[PDB]
Each structure stands twice: as C-alpha cells, then as structure tokens.
Amino acid sequence: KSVIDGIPSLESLCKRAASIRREALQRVTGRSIEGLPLDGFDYESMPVGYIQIPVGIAGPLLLDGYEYSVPMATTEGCLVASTNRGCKAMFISGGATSTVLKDGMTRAPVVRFASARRASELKFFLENPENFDTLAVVFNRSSRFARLQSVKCTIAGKNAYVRFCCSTGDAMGMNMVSKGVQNVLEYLTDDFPDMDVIGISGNFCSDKKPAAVNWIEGRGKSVVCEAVIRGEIVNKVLKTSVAALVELNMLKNLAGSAVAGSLGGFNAHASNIVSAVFIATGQDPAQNVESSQCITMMEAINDGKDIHISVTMPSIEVGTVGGGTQLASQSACLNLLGVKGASTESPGMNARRLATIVAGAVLAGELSLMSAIAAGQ
Amino acid sequence: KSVIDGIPSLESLCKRAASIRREALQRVTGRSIEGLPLDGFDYESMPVGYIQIPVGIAGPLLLDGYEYSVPMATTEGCLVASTNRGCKAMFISGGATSTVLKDGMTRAPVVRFASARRASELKFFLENPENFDTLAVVFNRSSRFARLQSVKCTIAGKNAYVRFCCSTGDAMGMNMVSKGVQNVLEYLTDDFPDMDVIGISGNFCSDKKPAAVNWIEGRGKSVVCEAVIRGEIVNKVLKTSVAALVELNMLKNLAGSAVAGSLGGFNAHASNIVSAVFIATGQDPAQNVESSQCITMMEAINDGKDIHISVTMPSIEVGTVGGGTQLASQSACLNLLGVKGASTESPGMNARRLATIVAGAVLAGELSLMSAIAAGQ
Amino acid sequence: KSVIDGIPSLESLCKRAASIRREALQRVTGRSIEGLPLDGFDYESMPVGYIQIPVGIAGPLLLDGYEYSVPMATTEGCLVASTNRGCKAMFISGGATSTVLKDGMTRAPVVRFASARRASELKFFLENPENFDTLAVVFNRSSRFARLQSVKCTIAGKNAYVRFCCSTGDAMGMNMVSKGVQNVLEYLTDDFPDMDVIGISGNFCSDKKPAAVNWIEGRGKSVVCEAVIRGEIVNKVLKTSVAALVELNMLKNLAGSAVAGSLGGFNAHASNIVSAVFIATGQDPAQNVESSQCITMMEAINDGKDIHISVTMPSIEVGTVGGGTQLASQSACLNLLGVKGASTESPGMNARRLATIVAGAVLAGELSLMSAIAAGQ
Amino acid sequence: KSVIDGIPSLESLCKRAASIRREALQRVTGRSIEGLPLDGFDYESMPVGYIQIPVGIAGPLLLDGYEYSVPMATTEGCLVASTNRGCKAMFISGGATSTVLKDGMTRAPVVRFASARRASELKFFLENPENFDTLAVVFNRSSRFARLQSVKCTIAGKNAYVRFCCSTGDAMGMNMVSKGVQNVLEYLTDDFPDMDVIGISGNFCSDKKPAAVNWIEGRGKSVVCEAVIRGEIVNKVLKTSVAALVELNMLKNLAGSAVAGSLGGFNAHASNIVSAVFIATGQDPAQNVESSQCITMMEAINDGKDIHISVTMPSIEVGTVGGGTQLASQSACLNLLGVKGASTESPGMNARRLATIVAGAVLAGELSLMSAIAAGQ
CATH class of the missing domain: 3.30.70.420 (Hydroxymethylglutaryl-CoA reductase, class I/II, NAD/NADP-binding domain)
Known part of the structure; x- marks a missing residue:
C-alpha cells in the first residue's frame, strides 16, 4: 500500500504491478473503477484491468462446403439474431461460395x-x-x-x-x-x-483510413462472396419478393450511397458484422474502417424467379498469428472457426479462410437486414 | 447434460442457459473454446462466453482546465505509451482546448x-x-x-x-x-x-459507413481540439523542429491523403485512439468508421517559433446512457472520466464531454506519432 | 508593318491591334497561324483571332409543355444525332418534366x-x-x-x-x-x-472543381428532369426491354461508377451534352466540371410495363446575362431557346429555364446512349 | 426557298444544306439566329452555323528549354493576362521542367x-x-x-x-x-x-466523369511540371513571401479541398487553363472534367529562401490527330505550339508534348492566381 504512496513521484515489482496502479489511479483520480475486473486475466500474455464483451454465435454458416459457428463479440443480441436468420436462409439455399481475388498487405x-x-x-x-x-x-x-x-x-x-x-x-x-x-x-x-x-507511412498505404487507393487496388484480402436464394424461399422464409429486394438494393445500397457521397459504403451494415467478428477473433478494431469496405449486389436471375446476392470486399485486413489473436479468449474464437495460428497446409491459408468467413457472415447480415426492410414494406 | 443432447433438435432454463449452449457448441463443432471464459460476467445485464481486452491508461490529459486519465482498451502497450507521451507534451504546453461545433444524431x-x-x-x-x-x-x-x-x-x-x-x-x-x-x-x-x-435508412444518414454527407454536414458531435507547443518544448521534448512538424503534416496528412483519394482521412492514426476509447467506454465499435473522420492541422505561429496543432472531427458518435455503456467494466471506464450516465447539470453534457475527451486523446496521439516520425528524420 | 518591328521591344492603336499582334507572333514564333481567322468578328465586344465550332440542332425537345431546338456546339455529328434520337423518343412519350430544387451561386x-x-x-x-x-x-x-x-x-x-x-x-x-x-x-x-x-476563395465554394460540398449542398441550379417511356415504345423504337434498360443503368451508371470511385459521375455522358450546350450558349466551359454532376435513375413502373427515367443534377452553373452570353453567335443560340438576356417576367427565370433545358437535353442523351448500349446486347 | 417548305415533312442537296436548315429553323422556331454566322467555314471538313471564341496568347512559356506562345480560347482577357503574368515570372526563374510519368488511354x-x-x-x-x-x-x-x-x-x-x-x-x-x-x-x-x-463502357474507364480510378491509376498522359522561384523574385515581382505562398497553398489547395471533399481538385483553377487550351487546340471539351485533375504543391527550399512549385496532373487527355484537331482554326493553334498532326520523330511525341504544354500553362496560372491572392493579404 506504501507503493501507491510513491501518487507523489508509472512504468513498473505483471498482476502485482497491475493491482498497484489501480489503487494509485482511484486515489489520485477520486473515481471508483469498481466494476472493471483485475482477476481472471494473465497479464504476462500499463494495464489497470480489462473490459468484457459477450460473444454470441451466428450459424451454421455454410461456406465453400463447410459449416461454421461464427463468433460475434457485441452488446446487441439483435445483431447475432439477425445474422443467424441470414445464415439459415443461405443454409437451405445451397450455402455461400467465396473467391479470394487478391491477398497482400501494403505500406507506402x-x-x-x-x-x-x-x-x-x-x-x-x-x-x-x-x-x-x-x-x-x-x-x-x-x-x-x-x-x-x-x-x-x-x-x-x-x-x-x-x-x-x-x-x-x-x-x-x-x-x-x-x-x-x-x-x-x-x-x-x-x-x-x-x-x-x-x-515510413505517407498515408498512401492506406492504414486505418478510408481511401480510394484501397477500394481501387485492394489491401490485405480482396474477397467476393455469393449465394442464390430461390423465389419460393424469398416468398415463404424472407416474406418478400425478388423484385422488392433488387429494387431496395438499387435504391438503398447503390443510389442512396451515391447520393450520400460514399467511398466503399455501398452496403447496409457490413461494419456491424466485421467489427463483431474482428473483436471476437482478436483482430485490430481500428482496421474495421477499411475492412468494412463493401459493395452489396442483388440481381434477378432465371427469368426473375431467383435472386443472386453477393458482397465484394476489397480490403479485409485479418491475421491468425500475432497481436490480440494469441490471447486466450480470442484464440478460442479462432479455434471455433478452425483457423487458430499458422496454416499447416500452406502459409496464409488460415488468414485467407478467416477473410472468406467474415465475407460470408457479412453476406448473411446483408440478406437478413435487407429482407427485413423489404418485408416491412 | 441431457439438455446438450436436445444437438438433436437454441433460444432458451441466463448463466445456466449460457453454460448449456457452450457444451452443445463444442460437442457439435468438434472445436475446444477452452480459453473463452463463462464465469465472471452477469449475463442478466445467444451468449456462449465473453472476450477480454486489457485497459491501459493515457494521461493526465489536460483538457479545458480539467485532468483526465483516459481508458484505452487495446492489445498494444505501444499505443497507450505513445498517447501518454502526447498527453505529457500538451500538459507542459498549457493543455488542450475543445469546442463543440454541432451536436445532433441523424436518420435518413x-x-x-x-x-x-x-x-x-x-x-x-x-x-x-x-x-x-x-x-x-x-x-x-x-x-x-x-x-x-x-x-x-x-x-x-x-x-x-x-x-x-x-x-x-x-x-x-x-x-x-x-x-x-x-x-x-x-x-x-x-x-x-x-x-x-x-x-427507415436509405444510407443518407449515413450510419457505420464513410460518407461525404457526414464530413460536410456532421453527425453526432462535431468537435475541434487545439493546443500550442512552444519551440523550446518541440526542440527539447519532441526532438524535432516546428518546420519539420508543419512539413510532415502537409506531406503526410494533407498531400498524402489527397494522393490516396481519402474521404475524411486527413490524419495519422485517429482510428487507433477512437477505437481504443470507444471499446473501453462501451460505445458501438462499428461507429468507429465515421467517428475517426479527422483533419489534423499543424501551423507555425509567433514568427515560426511555436506550433498550433488541432484535430477537427465532424462525426464523433458517443453516448453515456444505453447499449454497452451500462455493462460493469465499460461503466467503470466512463466513471473514471466522470461522464457515467445522464448529465445532472443538463441532458447531453456528459456525451458532449466524452466527445471532447476522444478529440483530446486523438490530438495527443497525433502529436506523439507525428513527433516520432519527424524526430526519426 | 513597322509596328510589327517594335518584336524588338504587347498591350496596345481593336481589329487594327488584333492584326498587328498576328504578324508579330508569326514572325517571332516562325509558325504559320494561317487557318485562324481574324475577319468576321467584332473585337470591340490580347486577341490574335478566333476558333470556329459548328452548331448542330437537337430536337424538338418537349419540356414542361414547350418545344425547344437545342443548339449543341461540337465537332461530332454523332453526339447531335444521338441526342436528337433521345428527343424523338421522349416527344412521343409525353415529353419531359423538370423541377428546380434550389437556385443560388456560392463563394467560400x-x-x-x-x-x-x-x-x-x-x-x-x-x-x-x-x-x-x-x-x-x-x-x-x-x-x-x-x-x-x-x-x-x-x-x-x-x-x-x-x-x-x-x-x-x-x-x-x-x-x-x-x-x-x-x-x-x-x-x-x-x-x-x-x-x-x-x-476570397478557400476552395470550399467550390468553383471549377469536383467537390462533395456541391454534390451534397448544390451550387447554381439544382434540377431534376424526368419522363416515362411506355413498354411498346421501348420495344418498337428503342429496340430493347424495360428490364434491360433498368439492369444496364444499375450495372453501368450506379455499380460501375461506385466501383470506379466516382464523385457525382453516376451517368453515361452528361458531360458531352452539358459541354456542347455550354459552348453554344456562351457559358463558362470550365464550369462543365461541376455542371455535369448527375445521377441517372431508370426504374420499372406499372407492373414492369413502362420505365421512369430521370437525371438529378445538383450544380448546373448557367447565366443568360454577362460573360460570353452577350457575344453575337452565343446570343443567337440563347435566342433560339428563348432565354436571351434578363427575364422580363421575373429576374432569374431565363437562367432557371436554361438550366432545365440542359437537364432535358442530358436526359435525351442518357436515354439514347443507354438504349443503344442495351439494344446492342 | 420551296425546300424550307418541305417544315411540313432534316438529314439532307454541305453549305447549301447548311443554309436550307437555317431558314427552316427560324421559320418553324419563330426565333432569329441572326448573329450566328453561316459563311466563313468549310462544312465539308446537322450544322446550322458556328460559334466564335476569341484566342488570346499567353507567353513566352519556357518549358524543357523551349519557348511557347500558348493559344487560349476564352471570353475573359483577365485569364490570358493572369496566365501571361505567370509565364513571365517562370521565364526569369529558369523556366519549367515537365516529366511524363505515364501515357495510355483506357476503356473498361x-x-x-x-x-x-x-x-x-x-x-x-x-x-x-x-x-x-x-x-x-x-x-x-x-x-x-x-x-x-x-x-x-x-x-x-x-x-x-x-x-x-x-x-x-x-x-x-x-x-x-x-x-x-x-x-x-x-x-x-x-x-x-x-x-x-x-x-463497351461500364463507367470504370472512366470517360468524361471524375473518378478515383483515373486519379489513382492515371488516364491518357500523367504529367508533373515544376519550377523554382527565387525569394528575390517572389518579393520584387510577385509582391509576396515564400512563407505566405506555402501557407496559402496548404490552407486553400490542400486543407480547403479536403474540407470540401474534393476528388482531384487540389488546385486553384487548373480547369480555367485546361478548358481554354483544349478549345483552342480542338480537344474534346467534355474531357476537361478529368484533364483538369491536379494537385498543386508549393514548398520552401534552400533554408526557406526559394519556393519549389509544381502541378501533378494524372489524366490529361489530348491528341494532335483526328476529331476537332484537323479543323482550320484549331489546326493553326496546334501549329503555333509546333505539335500539329502525327509526330515525325516517333508516334505519340506530339500529343505528349501538348500534354506537357497544358501542364506548364496550368503551373503559370496557379503561380499567378496564388501570388495575386497572397499579395492581396
């Protein structure tokens, strides 16, 4: 307790030091940080505590023939529930197909x-x-x-x-x-x-900023993810029509974003899903800014009977090694997806698969929210 | 354990239900989520667990005459350490002054x-x-x-x-x-x-997307935050010159962002600081996309002897009531800042002050990173 | 001829001075400017001559109940011919309706x-x-x-x-x-x-530059122009379907412009028509940059039988008084449109009507080019 | 005159046909086009006449060691006079140096x-x-x-x-x-x-529209043009300081354009100069939209004594063969510049040199207008 004294006149005695700074901060600040836990975290892995965000599960997400239980770190049960509804609709529609179009990190x-x-x-x-x-x-x-x-x-x-x-x-x-x-x-x-x-950075990378260089050129993983929902499922399950979904996509995600002067924002709520998966899997939450870049496309196919749905995301910035990915809770979430750590098969395959899962979860979220809007007409 | 059975043929029996779903998920998935904790969280406040992010402290941040210990939820000690260096430099320079230019949430x-x-x-x-x-x-x-x-x-x-x-x-x-x-x-x-x-949303709001409507018009809290660093402190503490900092700001944050085709990205790493404070204080992490919008300005004043530094952030989207703000750990972080819950003085004053603190922490981060780059020349 | 001498040792002796400078320029330059005419122009209205651009006529354009013969100053017969085809199609479809949404010039x-x-x-x-x-x-x-x-x-x-x-x-x-x-x-x-x-200008006006402030806020005349083409006319005259035109608009003018990172460029060739009318009517050709800003919308109506077509142009910058508008040839072109000089009825009505005519001619050009593309599938 | 009759019941009898349509148009329209000339133009080179734009001369422009008399087709003597002042200032400062960074036309x-x-x-x-x-x-x-x-x-x-x-x-x-x-x-x-x-065009080219693809990737000729103005000439001739010009460039052309949400508009009035030279030399006036894309940079050099000035223009779209370039008046203007027709030396060299001249004239215009603004403080 004399350590808290010298308040008088951190960079440490990890948990022992963690505990010392907490009392020093409450004493000097006059503010209780009572509900911020200290215990339950390995600090060896200027910390004063840790915040807790609950992890909900969306799925099963059927993606390139595999089933995924998608961990989503968020406050809102309604985001997990909505993404879950999107996963179900695609699951009975043959699932989603992803394609990695480009894979490389940049510095300028x-x-x-x-x-x-x-x-x-x-x-x-x-x-x-x-x-x-x-x-x-x-x-x-x-x-x-x-x-x-x-x-x-x-x-x-x-x-x-x-x-x-x-x-x-x-x-x-x-x-x-x-x-x-x-x-x-x-x-x-x-x-x-x-x-x-x-x-070392002249802002042309461009890291943690919305930039046309990343939209045009890509950064990290450039991914397209697609599914076909049959007319009978659009009617019976999503409670709308092919026509209503195509029109809403054009008026909201294309024309609306155009009128707003959007850069890479041609989508309903990619940011919501990207942020939740990013935090669950120990990604850098600041890279949500460019990783959420997305154009959502919805087109009538088969003489207007069915709908082709896709998300094209040019700059998904993910890894499965280093940073927050090797903390206990976030590691467990990567392990659920089967992409924990470096790839056994070939280096980069785990981070690529993680990117395709984000895109698949975004597609599910786009289908669910856009269906709910259309059905509410 | 028979509950986990019916796997055969969530939406519940909160913690009891939380525990049931975990075993069902590991059994059905074939994947261990061992390091994801269940215990230590009040689930009454489809959860399967919670992730932990450590909270570091940056400060003291001297802002409009008050001192703040800024909670930053992040993996990187280096982000807290760098923001801390920025806080010290401004603390001996008379501190920062914020001005709220506009305050209103939009829906389109x-x-x-x-x-x-x-x-x-x-x-x-x-x-x-x-x-x-x-x-x-x-x-x-x-x-x-x-x-x-x-x-x-x-x-x-x-x-x-x-x-x-x-x-x-x-x-x-x-x-x-x-x-x-x-x-x-x-x-x-x-x-x-x-x-x-x-x-209800035609993407013209524009929520969780980078849009020129928000850059031009503002959304949530539009804030400017400024400080003056004296030549003698730029030399002795930041290990650079007024000239080098002004030139780096023009070449990196203005010209560089222009060449990159940036929208609202005229800054070094506002996103890093916004994300860390947003997660610490239970904000919506997806709103980091527009809340990180920032132009950093650095100008020589007093016959080139001193430097005027500012961040102008048109769309800081924060609240101190509702959502994640009323969970235990995030509540404690708002309480540290003295902005927990609704304002006693006048409704909105707590959320306004939170926005000025984010802008102050961003200014500190900009000064520290830009000084480190300039000093490294 | 001794005047051309002092070549030896701009600003004048108007035509007399015009003639002197020409010989001085050919003598000093070593270059013949033989095909640049001097005669046929009143220089009283450092000139060395004048260029000639031929004026073609598009129409009749049926707009808010009136018929217009639209003067188009251009090199390409194919632009006049294509705009003419668009005018015919709208003429048998009940013509176009314009609405002025805002009218005001800015300086920042x-x-x-x-x-x-x-x-x-x-x-x-x-x-x-x-x-x-x-x-x-x-x-x-x-x-x-x-x-x-x-x-x-x-x-x-x-x-x-x-x-x-x-x-x-x-x-x-x-x-x-x-x-x-x-x-x-x-x-x-x-x-x-x-x-x-x-x-006096901080580039926030924003004059003769593409800027989101002008797209979001408008500048000069903000105009929407619309027409309905019946299914039977889309089939028989335009040689396409309602479905093909709506799909081409979404894939080319909306998705394509989005993928390109367009600002205000959500259209096929508004710039071609704006430039031709601007030069014919003595407008400032440099203001074509923001006056060409346009979103083209094409939507199926009446159970998919007919097509609603529109152009929304937020920043048409025109006048009928001052500048090039009071030269002989350009005055004659304004007079053809019945908008020469200041409004007798009420000040600004001539410049407003000119803006609606530009938008109507752009709509005709969009319908013709988009029909030709669709029909060519 | 019976031809004008059948008004009763565009595509022709070139000048003879030109004359017939004029009377038909005045008769049917009820509008005099008296001041639009018919005579003085070879129509063999639905025309009803031609407009006249006067050509002023800016220079001498000293560019890569050669002197140019720059033809500018415009209404305003003040634009020619201002560009002329910029040419003089650079002429006594060692002239301008251009570099072609890329040369290729696109279709998408x-x-x-x-x-x-x-x-x-x-x-x-x-x-x-x-x-x-x-x-x-x-x-x-x-x-x-x-x-x-x-x-x-x-x-x-x-x-x-x-x-x-x-x-x-x-x-x-x-x-x-x-x-x-x-x-x-x-x-x-x-x-x-x-x-x-x-x-054949999906708007990703992107032709006659402002697009980030053209800013990032270039289109046509990508050019940088630069000059150094000595302190003594900035003081005595331009009536300002190095400091004032650098600060105005940063506040107007960089920060101002950023605040406006500009795409490629990081300049004072490139559009004014590009349009005037484009029309003089028979270029496509609609391509002024992307050809005016420019970042103006002004930096203190030689311990703050001198100023390095440049324009970087990624998408100058010019040719010296085909289109309006082979009409008499516009041909004479190309011939003045010594870039008429195809290159004798090597194909494309004339169109490249034309692009460098546009960039040089833009640099002169930027220096003159920015000096006038700075001097007016």
Missing part, C-alpha cells in the same frame, strides 16, 4: 528529392520489371514469410509515395511489410543518396 | 412517389420553415429527450432521402431519432398518401 | 484567427438566425439582383471556410456573390478585428 | 457471368502474364498505332469491369482502344462462351 512511405524529375527516376527504377528480383531479395530478408508482390510509385511534385505490396503468411503483416520497406529504403541509399525519407 | 429514410415533381412537393413541404413547429411536435413525442433540429430532403429521381437531425440527451440516439422519423412518416400519410416508405 | 472565403475557439465564435455569430437580416443588408448592397439566402461556416483548426449562398438574377453570379462577400468581410472588421482574410 | 467494358467464381476465372486469365502476348496480338490488330500495355479486371459480384490500357500514337485514342477491346471480347467467346457483354 513518403520520400522526396530536390526535383519531380529526380523523383520520377526513382519511380522508373522501382517500376522497371528488370529490377524486381533485386528489390524482392532485399525486401524478403524481412522474414521467412515475406514475399514482395509489387511496388507502385506515385509522384506528387518532388515527392514519391511508394506503395509496397507483399504476402505475409497468416500474419496481418503490418510489421513484416514495414521491415521489408526499411530494407529497400536502406538498399536505395546507393543509387539515391539525395533521397530524404519523410516517413 | 428513403421514400418514393410516382414522379420527381411529386417528390419535390414533399421536399418544399418539409423544408418550409412555417411547417417546422408541427414537424417538431410530431417528432418530439419520440422521447422526453428528443428535440428535432432540422429536416433536409435530397431528391434523386422520384425518390426522397429525408435527413432528420435531432438532439438525444446523453444517448448516442440512433433508436430515438428512428422513433421520431416513424412519427413524422405516419403524420405525413395525411398530405402524402401516395408516399411509399422504401426503408 | 478562407479566414483565420489565433485559435479554433475564436474561429468558432465567427461560426456561431454568422449562423445565428438573429444576425441574418443585418448580414443580408450588408451583402445585398452588392447589386440590385443580389439576395443572400444562407451563410454556412465550416471550421478546420483555427481556420473558417465561410460558404455564402445568394440568388443573382439571370447572371451566373460569380462576380456578384464575390462583391457581397467583400461587403460582409469589411463589415466583420468591427466585431472581428483579429480576423485574417487568407483568400 | 462491363461483362457478366452466372457467378462471381466464374467472373474471377476471366480475371485470373486476363491478369496472367503468360496470356499477355496473345491478348496484345488480338488487341493490336486495332491499328498500326495500337499497343496494349495492361489489362486490369475488377470483379463486383458476378460482373467484371475490365480496364484495358494502350498507347494510341498522337490520337486521343478513344476509338482505337474501343476497336481493340472489341477484338479481345470476340477472341474471348472461345474460352468464355457464357460471357454476357453488358456494355
């Missing part, structure tokens, strides 16, 4: 020269296919798992925003892409000694 | 008519100042706390996207604005019996 | 203070309804025709972007809104002597 | 399949480097000058937006890229007989 440092002419010489150097193997060798010293895929260099005046894209195995891969970029920036001091490195 | 139903001419008659009706008091009376039956502020009606063909804005006291207010919109849509069946209500 | 100076707190005091002052009549009196000294409608002040750090909106009679009104803004900025030196005026 | 058809899985198979086929030479051979039958550079396929649900990029020699190249796309779509019916071609 800003560097500058004395002229745009000189900056353009870095661009032409880096984008010359003959130089790729050398840049990749330098980059890939980053890690066992780092594989450079591309370098795109955008010039703005005497500045270059140099977008590196690489695979990172089952890691989300922000630390890996960064080490790789540092290798290439050090290697470049030979042919480019006039280069000033302004920052 | 999509309705349609047989013609754009007819849709325009709803627009001119709703936007006619003589009709406001009648619309407000109908709207404000929503709640003791519901106060209609404005109605803006955007026409797209024969469709109207009708944006309602109202104060909601200390509630985030999505349910309140929605009840109010339903009152007005029912009242309108008199003068507009030809009106088809397509949906 | 950037001003700054020592703090965001102080900048916010200008915001609250300017947006306080009690101050409006005083601001309007100061503003409206601008002109006989200047009528202030609104002032919106956006704060970014210690800077204010102050958006003034006013009616300007039949003038496009950029010079009028500017004089009015100067009056208000001078009047404000009393209560705001600390205010630094950084520029 | 929308095609669809029964599934996103099947659509993804077209993507992987088209983006497989092993298939490139076959696709290029099929594409390049388009023309002597058509050279396929890249194919990027974006999937949205069961739809593919397939972006083809090719060089087109000195032609703007919209017709060439289109023939090439038709070759590839016909060749694909072998391996993809299930493919439905919805349209």
